[PDB]
Design a binder for this molecule. Sequence first.
Ligand code: PXP
Ligand code: PXP
Lengths: 259, 259
Amino acid sequence: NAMLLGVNIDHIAVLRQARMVNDPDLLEAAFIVARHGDQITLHVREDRRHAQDFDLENIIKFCKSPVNLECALNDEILNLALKLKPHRVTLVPEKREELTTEGGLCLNHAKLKQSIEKLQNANIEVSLFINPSLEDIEKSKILKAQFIELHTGHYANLHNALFSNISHTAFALKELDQDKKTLQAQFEKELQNLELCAKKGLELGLKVAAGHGLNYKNVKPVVKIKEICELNIGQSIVARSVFTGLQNAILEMKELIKR
Amino acid sequence: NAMLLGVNIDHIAVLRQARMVNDPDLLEAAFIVARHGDQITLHVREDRRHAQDFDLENIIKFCKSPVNLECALNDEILNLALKLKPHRVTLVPEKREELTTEGGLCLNHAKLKQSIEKLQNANIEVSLFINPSLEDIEKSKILKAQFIELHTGHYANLHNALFSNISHTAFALKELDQDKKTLQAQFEKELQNLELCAKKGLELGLKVAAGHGLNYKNVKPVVKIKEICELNIGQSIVARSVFTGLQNAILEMKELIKR
Ligand code: PXP
Ligand code: PXP
């Protein structure tokens, strides 16, 4: 079961929007992802912080790759999805009403069920970005999602605190200022839980993806979870690309997820 | 007269601050600049938008390269310069009181003369980032600057409008929505003026640098201005690095500025 790699190009658009001179060119970057990744992912936020409507249009029109649009439950972006028809839509929280404390989508949101229906009626694959809880997995099955994407964010931060220098830097997370034994127990639980949730997802006929915070060090134990078929990774790849170029950054990640 | 290249690493720090996970690592990037550039430039803004105090400290402590700190006329950053002693300080506007309409430093600012004195008293080289006007060049000589850095920002935007696709994109500048002939006349004047100002600077014993907006296409006519000894370039290099890696991005630029 070869793992698939979705490359989220949001942070290339972050750089672009930082100077407003169309450099880096997101479509150039998308051509490289189309060739060396398995899908192109982007999040067109309601506030248009990074990726834009025209980016989604351009990528759909020009790139030889499946497209995964991440978006929230606002009508404007949903309608855009319905108009342009990316291959897949991954529903993610942006507003408070969509959020949970842990960062996955609130699966009780009033608009969620109809949103899913609208998308599937338009023949768009639907993925729900969720906390790794057995309850959220079972609800996702009930809501008729084809995919779920497990939030690896807490796992990633734990891995970083334990096996890198991040706690000695200005980027240290105050919440992870606890003794190593407690951190190590939480890390093991979090990884165990990701595996349990993937198995549950697979048992219910869902396709299981994982994403948020994955990097070239913390990805390695996630690859060993046989039941995860796809990782969606952005920020760490774009951060590596500053040193190696995007092609090599993607190819390096592909080598790590071989199994 | 081989042209020197200062690499401004601000936009690598922009990426880092976008996710707050110490990736990309600015010190890693600074090691690459130290090796392949001629100086490392960074702007520690009062608002700490990108580069941080600890970045200046780390680079000064660890990197085998001259350091050029860009900063404004606030006491906090000046004191930091005085404490850490980069090789050079380039005084740039951040607040309204420091600004001119065109983007160079206001050379009448009340604190400017004393700021220059404080820095030179500490044996820090001082550069003034200025509009390309003969008047600002003569004042910079009077203020006893060792360097001036000509603002190539208007030149760059003109070049982009004329010789790239930028006017057909969402990044088009409304002010440059004018007919090609007027743009072409303004472009020629702007380039002529940059040359005139460099010659004037050199005539007065100033060292002449140039920066803002320079990229792999618009740099080429600037290299032909014999009297400019140094270019300071950031955003275009970091934008290229996403595709080629920072080493190759720097080396590519170095090849273009050979003369
Ligand atoms: C649902 C989802 N998956 C994966 C990613 C990629 O995450 P990262 O940039 O941390 O790798 C994102 C972007 O935050 C996302 O929203
Ligand atoms: C004085 C000065 N020179 C050069 C640069 C580099 O400019 P750019 O990032 O547009 O190449 C900057 C950063 O805006 C600067 O402040």
